[PDB]
């Protein structure tokens, strides 16, 4: 299914007008939740525009409880598979600072801003979610 870019359909089919017949095709958000079973899969969905569509669905869905749910389910999944324990992250950033200290000792500046964000922040960040 990956080899034939199935995500191309599951991204598209979910952004549509709503209506009782279509609210059901959006219930096919489930299809996406069931497929995304790992981190690598979550990142594949993103690379297909998964994150932008889910955001656009969630935001249109205040008065659409059924799809609001199904879409929040998908995102929680994506986050889960991509978010690490605050601990592992803390560790990661301590290490980053260590490397920094080492070079300086030999030769103290800051780790690369983006590298540091990449280690410290959860999946939301790795998947390109922004504040706004």
């Amino acid at each position: 299914m990956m080899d034939a870019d199935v995500f191309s359909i599951l991204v598209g089919c979910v952004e549509v007008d709503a209506n009782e017949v279509t609210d059901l095709v959006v219930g096919g958000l489930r299809c996406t939740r069931r497929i995304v079973r790992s981190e690598e899969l979550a990142f594949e969905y993103c690379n297909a525009g998964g994150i932008a569509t889910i955001a656009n669905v969630i935001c249109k869905s205040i008065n659409q409880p059924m799809v609001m749910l199904e879409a929040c389910r998908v995102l929680l999944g994506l986050l889960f598979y991509t978010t690490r324990s605050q601990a592992d992250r803390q560790a990661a950033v301590e290490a980053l600072h260590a490397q920094c200290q080492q070079r300086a000792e030999q030769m103290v500046p800051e780790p690369d801003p983006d590298e540091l964000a990449n280690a410290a922040y959860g999946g939301w960040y790795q998947m390109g979610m922004d504040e706004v």
Binding site: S8, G12, A52, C59, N63, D114, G128
Partner: protein, 1874 residues
């Protein structure tokens, strides 16, 4: 209504709940703002929701308590502005009230916060503008002041400032507003800003303009301080360069200093007091007075000489005496002198007081006072303009003195600019050119470029000079020894922002390179790199790159390539740091790869790949500074390389889509703005790659469609990216024969496009590009529409036209609206319904219901079909009623309380919707016909007259629509315009523009209506005699003269343009001239010569007037000012082609050959010459350039130059090659000129050419010379391209050996880069092909260079001129048989067949008419001559392949030229008779007529243009005739275009001669075409086109030919005799024969005589019904239609038969009388044409059933009723037919009795059998219902017939017939008999 985003509610509650606590208020408001932005497609709805939820009290408290927060201000401004937009469209008065009262206070508080942020200002400014439009403006005064304070803060973006100063200016127009500004900081504030933080960008100038307008108005309410005058003057010296600002300053001063002050000062100066006193004081005052240009004259009256006095005598000796003091005085004086050199008359005064000497000598003294020297320099420039004066000035050596001083004192800024200005205006004179060059030359001016790099003017002057001097340079030494190249590279390097100077800089680098010892000094690489870098920064600048590739082609070496390419990857690896390093390598690669000779190195190392990999490494990484930059560059570097290369691109295309989809792209673009980021740069790049159409392979293609869909899937919210993607789909869709649509189908792409358009309806850019992609595919594959309807494209189309009162869109969304088109029957349904509903509401006095339903109906007429239907359904007659009702039910409308619109609003709104309906219907020829015939032009005049009193919200909306419907109708029927032309209506119309004085659409349409009725000299005299019209002229001139709005001036001018252009009468021109227009327009060009929009618009109007008016008249017969002005504009505007065109047009009308001295003196010719050089490729520039130079005595100059060329060749000088080159330059301009005596002017052509071919042979590889010689030869050939008897044209070229010379050069592959040679070389070859006596020689030399001709097309595939020239050649060359063979057997390679290469080039330049037209004409010409010379059809034309590619190259908006070429191509294929299957499959004839009908509807072209299409189309149809393709035509009513040509162009003889010829050919082809010709066409010729036939030789002769063809067949003669008008025409032809006499007249007389004899002699025997049967029966058995609507011969046949039969049918007939036997054939005749369902309606429009039935009841003979029966039996094969006959009361009983008669008869069995089978067949057919025959004895007759079978009487066939009838009539009622 649309529903608002639900989040608005939550956002707003946040804002209301937390108005004290700020941290969150902002957050909420920031969120409301984002909901309220055009990012969101529901911002208007969102905006209004917040209003109704009462968010503004909260915003109001917020902006008061937190005044300071700049960020809250930005958010507040955003929400309000959004509200402003919504309430403007949703014209609800309540909402408008609320936003006025509750919203404006906050916007005001924002403005009084003194914000500097562009956005907050734009918004609150745009808020203020919209509210005014809504009819609830914000008090200017309230905003004024707060708006001034904005300038108390610096850091103000000039762009924003320009807007603020404009807004101050309008505010200051009231004393209230002016005092507000005085109460706040006065003028000083603004003026100080201007002085301190003001720039010289086009924006800055527009800013200071508005500042000066502000002041002006303030000074007229004495709201001026005392700082104003001193400051204004300071500001004018700061901007002296820019005349638009200088002028607005002067205007401002004049409103501050009255004339009395002038008087005082001047006289005081006449009261001597010389020496301090008041004299030396008043002296200072005069200084200031000078700046006021309105006082210049009065100052010259009494003075001008004092100044020189105060300079020479009163200073020169005492210079040595008192340096400082003297200097100041000298300067002040010199400057005033400069300042008063306004008009040519004023500079005249100056020479009368020997200014030239005084000033020239003063220099010699002020060698040490920079200030004074510059003041002198300044006072000299105006004098040195004049040539006579310049020679005086060299005898004073003053140039020779200032140059060295400048050199050493260049760093000082005043002297530099002023010295240079003078060197510049000096350098414009050839005599001085040399003098200067001698004394240190421009080796100093080149260096001088190294300084003041931000002073555009300085740099401009300097470089313009150097480009007038380096041509005449032997060596590049000195300029190098001085370091001037290194100084122009500096200037270039420091000017990335000034596109203008950057250009000039490389032009000068280009020109340096043309010196011999260039390489010796310009192969440092430094220069190379500079130019390379310059090139990449300035991409969009055609002229700059072209000039750069030239420079590089000259000095660039592979030794430069490797110096870059050998560090490429190293630089890519070190891009995080030193991004500038790799930036350079990219720029080098990008540029050096446009040099064909050099690209190979990069190709070999596959640099494009190396770079694409770098790009990826620059995105998928930790972000770094310079990332975006290097990427955006690399993308361009890759794009360009591919574009200058030759491969297929599909690989690279994908690689780029892949790059755009890298995950880190989103993060990299968020630190940027939404339409200049690495994403849009990538989408742009790949779009551009698709444009090249180098995507070939159904696999390769799928990849691209997919890759583009992915990009648009990942990035829904990058609008520019989406656009660039849509665009990209289009190119791809029409790739690989246009098969792409299929892919897009399967890939689901179509639905994508539909679902984008649905999702983002607000983005017109997108709406158009999207539907574009749709329409394209629709036009390339059938059933695409199915999918579209299935994809709900309708929903889109609707909301499209329903949210866009545009045009281009509608045009695009037309083919869809014809495919989807709803069921169309539904449209019809709804339209009828709505008409009824509109009419009902008038009958029932429901004014609201009328409005509601008109608007509904207007939503259905946006479609060409809607309109066409409404016309048919009688919307015209309805409109009369609707109008009558509206006009006489106004106070009813006013009283309405229970509706969405109330008050006058409702009334006006209803007229508006009424007028709109008519406007729309009139989009089609049908509609205009119906509207006009129904009296709807009066209807409209009544509606317009109904608008009055308090301007309502819709009053203007309403006027516009009335006037537009009027404009269309009056323009479209001359008679209808001429009927409307009544003084009172003129008065109505004029008064109309007073009522809407600020409405530009109203003024535009009013003026069009006026011009359209002034159709003759008398009417013009009458229109101009109307005081209301003279007032309008006076008022239009007034706007042009006083209104500071650029947009107003433009509109006032476009309005004049239309009055004089449509009318095209001297009287009009004269009245407009006398209202002051000439001087006003010249003044535009004087003040705004730096503004293209203005200069052009003014020149266009001046030029039209100039055809009728001697423009000198308005300057007391002194040409100088208008010449000076135009020459100066031409200078400033040199690179803008359309602006030099219109300026040259005015100069040509201004000036006469009696002005040479004048024209020398003002240097006019120098500028014209240069304009021609810059625009060598321009038909219009060259032509007008020629006409100007013809005033200088071209005949003599050509003789002279041509003799000098010969002489210098025969001398054998060393200088020779260069000397002959300059001479050819000069000769080529004069050869553009029309001549008086060609035979005398051109007498030396052949010898001269001989001299020139010798020169080329002697000095090969002289690029310049090669070009100029070609240019000379082109102009020679062009002069007489079509006169094969002219000896000075292609004749001279071919006889002189020049043709063979050129052929050789191409064949020698030595010149395959001198585009300046190849262009005119191929035009020359074209001319030799077109001259029939030269053609054999072309064929001789062609094989040598044809192969290389292919190479050129591949090499210069990206240069559109070169391609056009070469394709034009192939087209003309393909008229020779042998030539055609050579082409097809000598021109193949990578691009493929010549025909393939042609499509490839056309596809690449779809936007270039020159390429496409040359392309299509070639294809056709080749196609034809091949067919004629035996060659087998080109395969790729015959498979429909190319017909389709050609069809795709037609845009909805395509020139007349392209439409003409396309017809020509098809004409030629039809004449070839070789490609008929292919033409039929592509429905070529249909699509041409669709094009043309569409063009008759929308009337986009002129009359001259459409005339020419019709003539052409006629010729197509004649080809169609000769190719036996009548019948394809009678499918789509093709004959109809011929009828339409006569009706619309009967007075135009060049159409009619074609119509005649086409009718003749169509007639010879098709017996039906003949019939239509006789019955329909000739009636129309002899009336509508009679005047043409009788007065034009060819019309007369062609008409006689047509007639002679028609009368040649039996029957036609008689009919033609009855034709009304024929006689008048024939005897008028007779008279045209008498006039011409000679041979032509004799044969013309004889033609008419023969026609008359054939007509007398046409005596066909009386025809019988039997003939009708024999023709139908023979038609039937050869499988030909017998449907009357399809076969014209049958109409006359069926009507004779109706009538002949009907007279028969009144008697009792016998089967043995002649008559009665003929009555049988008449029924057998009917029997056959009742067998086609098509004929049913017509048949039953003669009550066929009744007649037949009657015969059945009446007639006695069984054998005459048999045939009525058989015939009606066949009729009733069809259900409706049957129903009708059955319904007829008596039918059952009657046919039943017919059965009985036979059953009871004593007829022999065999006969009884036939009779009964027929009768029983009829009952079977007519028994549509089993009950029908209930009341009848049919079952007994059937049974009886059965019992006779039983008695062995009949065969089985009868029983079958009985059994069939029984089953149709069996019911309850027959059970007993059974």
């Amino acid at each position: 209504k649309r529903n608002p985003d639900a989040g608005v509610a939550t956002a707003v509650q946040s804002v209301i709940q937390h108005q004290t606590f700020k941290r969150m208020l902002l957050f909420g408001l920031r969120s409301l703002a984002d909901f309220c932005s055009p990012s969101n497609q529901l911002y208007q709805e969102n905006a209004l929701d917040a209003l109704d939820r009462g968010v503004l009290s909260a915003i109001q408290t917020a902006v008061t308590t937190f005044s300071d927060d700049d960020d809250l201000m930005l958010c507040a401004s955003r929400v309000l502005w959004a509200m402003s937009v919504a309430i403007k469209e949703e014209m609800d008065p309540a909402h408008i009230a609320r936003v006025h009262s509750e919203g404006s206070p906050v916007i005001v508080a924002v403005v009084n916060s003194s914000p500097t942020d562009p956005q907050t200002i734009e918004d609150s400014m745009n808020f203020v503008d919209n509210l005014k439009r809504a009819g609830a403006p914000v008090d200017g005064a309230s905003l004024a002041g707060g708006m001034l304070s904005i300038f108390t803060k610096t850091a103000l973006d000039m762009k924003t400032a320009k807007r603020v100063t404009a807004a101050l200016a309008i505010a200051a127009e009231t004393a209230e507003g002016s005092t507000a500004l005085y109460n706040a900081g006065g003028t000083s504030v603004l003026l100080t800003y201007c002085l301190d933080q003001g720039d010289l960008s086009d924006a800055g100038v527009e800013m200071v303009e508005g500042a000066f307008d502000t002041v002006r108005y303030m000074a007229g309410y004495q709201c001026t301080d005392a700082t104003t005058l001193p400051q204004c003057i300071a500001l004018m010296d700061k901007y002296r360069g820019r005349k638009s600002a200088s002028a607005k300053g002067s205007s401002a001063l004049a409103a501050m200093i009255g004339p009395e002050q002038l008087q005082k000062c001047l006289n005081t100066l006449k009261t001597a007091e010389a020496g301090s006193a008041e004299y030396d004081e008043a002296l200072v005052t005069l200084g200031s007075m000078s700046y006021i240009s309105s006082f210049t004259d009065e100052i010259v009256r009494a003075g001008g000489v004092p100044l020189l006095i105060e300079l020479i005598n009163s200073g020169l000796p005492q210079m040595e005496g008192n340096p400082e003091k003297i200097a100041s005085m000298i300067s002040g004086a010199a400057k005033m002198l400069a300042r008063i050199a306004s008009n040519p008359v004023n500079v005249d005064a100056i020479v009368q007081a020997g200014g030239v000497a005084t000033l020239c000598t003063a220099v010699s003294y002020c060698t040490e006072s920079m200030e004074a020297l510059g003041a002198l320099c300044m006072a000299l420039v105006p004098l040195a303009s004049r040539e006579s004066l310049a020679h005086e000035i060299v005898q004073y050596q003053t140039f020779a003195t200032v140059l060295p001083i400048l050199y050493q004192n260049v760093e000082s800024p005043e002297i530099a600019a002023l010295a240079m200005e003078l060197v510049a205006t000096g350098s414009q004179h050839e005599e001085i050119q040399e003098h200067m060059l001698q004394n240190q030359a421009a080796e100093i001016c080149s260096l001088c470029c190294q300084y003041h790099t931000a002073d555009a003017s300085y740099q401009q002057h300097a470089i313009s000079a150097l480009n007038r001097l380096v041509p005449r340079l032997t060596t590049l030494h000195g300029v190098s020894e001085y370091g001037g190249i290194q100084g122009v590279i500096a200037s270039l390097n420091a000017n990335v922002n000034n596109e203008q100077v950057a250009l000039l800089a490389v032009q000068l680098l280009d020109n340096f390179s043309e010196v011999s010892d260039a390489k010796t000094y310009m192969s440092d690489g430094t220069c190379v790199d500079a130019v390379l870098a310059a090139m990449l920064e300035h991409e969009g600048n055609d002229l700059l790159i072209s000039a750069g590739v030239h420079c590089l082609a000259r000095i660039a070496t592979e030794d430069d390539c490797a110096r870059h390419l050998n560090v490429l990857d190293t630089a890519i690896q070190t891009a995080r740091g030193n991004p500038d390093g790799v930036y350079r390598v990219l720029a080098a690669i990008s540029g050096l790869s446009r040099v064909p000779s050099l690209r190979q190195i990069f190709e070999e190392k596959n640099a494009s790949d190396t770079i694409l990999a770098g790009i990826s490494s620059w995105i998928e990484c930790s972000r770094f500074e310079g990332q975006n930059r290097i990427i955006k560059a690399a993308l361009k570097t890759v794009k360009n390389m591919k574009i200058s290369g030759d491969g297929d691109l599909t690989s690279c295309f994908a690689a780029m889509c892949d790059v755009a989809c890298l995950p880190q792209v989103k993060r990299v673009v968020e630190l940027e703005e939404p339409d200049n980021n690495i994403l849009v740069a990538d989408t742009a790049a790949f779009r551009d790659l698709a444009a090249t159409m180098r995507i070939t392979g159904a696999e390769n293609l799928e990849r691209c469609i997919e890759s583009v869909l992915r990009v648009m899937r990942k990035y829904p919210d990058s609008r520019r990216a989406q656009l660039n993607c849509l665009e990209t789909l289009n190119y791809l869709a029409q790739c690989d024969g246009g098969e792409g649509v299929a892919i897009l189908s399967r890939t689901g792409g179509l639905n994508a496009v539909v679902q984008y358009l649905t999702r983002a309806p607000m983005y017109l850019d997108a709406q158009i590009a999207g539907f574009t992609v749709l329409a394209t595919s629709a036009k390339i594959d059938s059933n695409v529409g199915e999918t579209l309807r299935k994809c709900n494209c309708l929903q889109a189309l609707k909301v499209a036209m329903r949210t866009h009162a545009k045009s281009k869109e509608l045009k695009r969304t037309i083919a869809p609206l014809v495919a989807l088109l709803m069921p169309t029957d539904a449209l019809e349904t709804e339209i009828q319904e709505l008409l009824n509903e509109c009419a009902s509401a008038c009958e029932k006095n429901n004014f609201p219901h009328l409005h509601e339903n008109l608007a509904a109906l207007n939503e259905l007429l946006i479609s060409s079909e809607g309109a066409k239907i409404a016309a048919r359904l009688g919307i015209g007659a309805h409109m009369c009623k609707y109008q009558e009702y509206i006009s006489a039910h106004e106070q009813d409308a006013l009283a309405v309380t229970d509706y969405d619109i109330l008050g006058k609003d409702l009334f006006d709104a209803t007229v508006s919707e009424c007028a709109h309906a008519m406007e729309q219907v009139a989009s089609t020829r049908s509609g205009r016909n119906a509207l006009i015939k129904a009296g709807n032009v009066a209807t409209l005049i009544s509606l317009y007259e109904s608008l009055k009193a308090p301007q309502s919200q819709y009053s203007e909306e309403a006027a516009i629509h009335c006037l537009e419907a009027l404009r269309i109708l009056l323009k479209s029927d001359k008679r209808s315009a001429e009927l409307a032309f009544e003084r009172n209506f003129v008065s109505t119309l004029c008064v109309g523009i007073d009522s809407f004085p600020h409405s530009a659409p109203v003024l535009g349409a009013t003026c069009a209506c006026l011009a359209a009725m002034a159709t003759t000299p008398e009417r013009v005299q009458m229109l101009t005699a109307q005081p209301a019209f003279e007032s309008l002229l006076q008022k239009l001139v007034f706007v042009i003269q006083n209104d500071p709005s650029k947009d107003n001036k433009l509109v006032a001018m476009r309005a004049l343009q239309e009055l004089v252009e449509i009318t095209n009468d001297a009287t009009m021109a004269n009245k407009i001239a006398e209202a002051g227009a000439v001087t006003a327009l010249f003044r535009i060009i004087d003040e705004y010569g730096d503004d293209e929009q203005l200069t052009v618009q003014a020149a266009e109007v001046l030029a039209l007037l100039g055809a009728f008016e001697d423009l000198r008249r308005f300057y007391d017969n002194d040409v100088r000012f208008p010449a000076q002005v135009l020459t100066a504009a031409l200078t400033k505007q040199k690179n803008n082609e359309t602006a030099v065109v219109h300026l040259l047009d005015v100069l040509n009308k201004l000036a006469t050959s009696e002005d040479r001295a004048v024209l020398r003196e003002l240097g006019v010719m120098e500028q014209v010459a240069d304009a021609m050089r810059v625009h060598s490729e321009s038909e219009a520039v060259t032509r007008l350039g020629g006409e100007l130079f013809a005033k200088m005595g071209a005949d003599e100059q050509i003789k002279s130059l041509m003799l000098q060329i010969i002489e210098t060749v025969e001398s054998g000088a060393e200088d020779t090659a260069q000397t002959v080159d300059i001479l050819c330059g000069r000769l080529a301009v004069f050869l553009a000129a029309p001549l008086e005596d060609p035979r005398d002017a051109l007498q030396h052509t052949e010898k001269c050419l001989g001299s020139l071919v010798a020169t080329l042979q002697t000095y090969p590889g002289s690029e310049r010379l090669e070009g100029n010689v070609a240019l000379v030869c082109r102009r020679l050939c062009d002069r007489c391209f079509d006169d094969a008897d002219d000896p000075y044209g292609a004749w001279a070229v071919a006889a002189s050996g020049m043709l063979a010379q050129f052929a050789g050069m191409v064949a020698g592959e030595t010149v395959l880069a001198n585009k300046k040679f190849l262009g005119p070389a191929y035009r020359t070859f074209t001319a030799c092909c077109a001259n029939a006596y030269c053609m054999p020689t072309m064929v001789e030399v062609a094989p040598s260079f044809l192969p290389q001709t292919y190479t050129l097309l591949e090499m210069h595939k990206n240069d559109a001129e070169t391609v056009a020239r070469v394709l034009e050649f192939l087209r003309y060359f393909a008229e020779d048989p042998t030539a055609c063979g050579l082409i097809v057997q000598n021109m193949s390679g990578s691009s493929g067949d010549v025909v393939a290469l042609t499509v490839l080039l056309m596809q690449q330049h779809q936007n270039n008419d020159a390429v496409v037209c040359a392309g299509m004409e070639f294809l056709g010409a080749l196609a034809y001559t091949l067919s004629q010379a035996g060659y087998e059809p080109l395969p790729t034309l015959a498979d429909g392949s190319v017909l389709r590619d050609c069809d795709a190259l037609m845009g909805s908006n395509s020139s007349s030229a392209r439409q003409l070429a396309h017809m020509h191509m098809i004409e030629k294929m039809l004449l070839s008779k070789a490609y008929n299957d292919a033409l039929i499959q592509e429905q070529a004839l249909k699509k041409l007529t669709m094009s043309l009908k569409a063009e008759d509807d929308k009337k986009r072209f002129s009359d001259e243009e459409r005339a020419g299409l019709y003539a052409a189309m006629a010729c197509v149809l004649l080809a169609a005739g000769g190719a036996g393709l009548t019948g394809e035509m009678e499918k789509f009513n093709g004959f109809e275009v011929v009828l339409q040509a006569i009706e619309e162009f009967g007075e135009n003889p060049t159409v009619i001669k074609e119509v005649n010829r086409a009718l003749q050919g169509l007639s010879m082809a098709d017996v039906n075409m003949t019939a239509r010709t006789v019955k329909e066409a000739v009636p129309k010729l002899c009336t509508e086109a009679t005047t043409a036939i009788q007065t034009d030789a060819e019309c007369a002769d062609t008409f006689c030919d047509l007639m002679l063809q028609l009368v040649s067949q039996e029957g036609n003669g008689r009919q033609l005799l009855q034709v009304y008008g024929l006689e008048e025409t024939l005897q008028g032809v007779e008279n045209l024969a008498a006039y011409y006499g000679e041979d032509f007249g004799t044969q013309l007389s004889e033609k008419v005589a023969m026609i008359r004899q054939a007509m007398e002699d046409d005596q066909p025997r009386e025809k019988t019904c039997k003939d009708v049967y024999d023709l139908l029966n023979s038609r039937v058995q050869q499988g030909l239609s017998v449907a009357i609507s399809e076969v014209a011969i049958l109409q006359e046949e069926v009507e004779f038969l109706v009538s002949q039969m009907g007279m028969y049918n009144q008697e009792q007939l016998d089967h043995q009388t002649a008559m009665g036997a003929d009555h049988q054939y008449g029924n057998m005749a009917f029997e056959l044409l009742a067998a086609t369902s098509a004929n049913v309606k017509l048949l039953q429009a003669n009550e066929f059933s009744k007649m037949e039935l009657a015969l059945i009841k009446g007639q006695a003979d069984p054998e005459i009723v048999l045939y009525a029966v058989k015939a009606l039996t066949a009729f009733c094969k069809f259900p409706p037919a049957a129903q009708d006959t059955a319904r007829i009361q008596g039918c059952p009983a009657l046919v039943t009795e017919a059965c009985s008669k036979i059953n009871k008869s004593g007829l022999p069995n065999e006969r009884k059998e036939e009779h009964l089978c027929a009768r029983y067949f009829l009952v079977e057919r007519t028994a549509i219902n089993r009950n029908l025959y209930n009341k009848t004895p049919i079952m007994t007759e059937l049974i009886n017939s059965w019992n006779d079978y039983d008695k062995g009487a009949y065969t089985t066939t009868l029983l079958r017939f009985v059994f069939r009838a029984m089953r149709r009539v069996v019911s309850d009622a027959h059970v007993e008999e059974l």
